[PDB]
Design a protein around this nucleic acid. Structure first.
Length: 96
RNA sequence: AGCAGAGUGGCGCAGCGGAAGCGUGCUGGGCCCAUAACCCAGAGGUCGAUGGAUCGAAACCAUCCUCUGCUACCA
């Protein structure tokens, strides 16, 4: 099961609904630095992000999850974390 | 945050002092057993909004909106 996790880590994406906090924006484009609070599910590395109300356009692929400049891999519900999201290569970068 | 570019028929696009167009798509007819191709028509336009220099702005200048890119400036 360790090897199954190791070669199925990219193909397995945990579900996550995320609520955005106002005015906690640092970088708007390349990369995306935005201090966003978990409200449902959990956040892991490589999890894509999209918007439901704008005909499902992807935001990008995340890089790291930081809780007060400390890298925590798994964040549960109810914690304010900082996520570094990078644009996917082959598609145009996005702005806040 | 700031800058640059663009806005014309459903779509893309020509287009500037005396001047609402093209390609494609939609509708009708001819041709044919039938279709494509082709022919004949027709429908579809706040030329992004505002002001002004103008006899004569779809056009030049100023502002603004929307859309498309960026110089990087964080835990």
């Amino acid at each position: 099961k360790k090897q199954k996790q190791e070669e199925f880590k990219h193909i397995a994406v945990f579900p996550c609904k995320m609520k955005i906090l106002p005015q906690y924006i640092f970088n708007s484009r390349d990369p995306i630095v935005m201090g966003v609070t978990v409200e449902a599910g959990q956040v892991k590395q490589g999890t894509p992000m999209c918007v439901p109300s704008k005909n499902f356009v992807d935001i990008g692929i995340v890089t790291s999850i930081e809780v007060n400049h400390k890298q925590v891999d798994v964040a549960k519900k109810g914690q304010e974390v900082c996520v570094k999201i990078e644009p996917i290569p082959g598609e145009s970068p996005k702005m806040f």
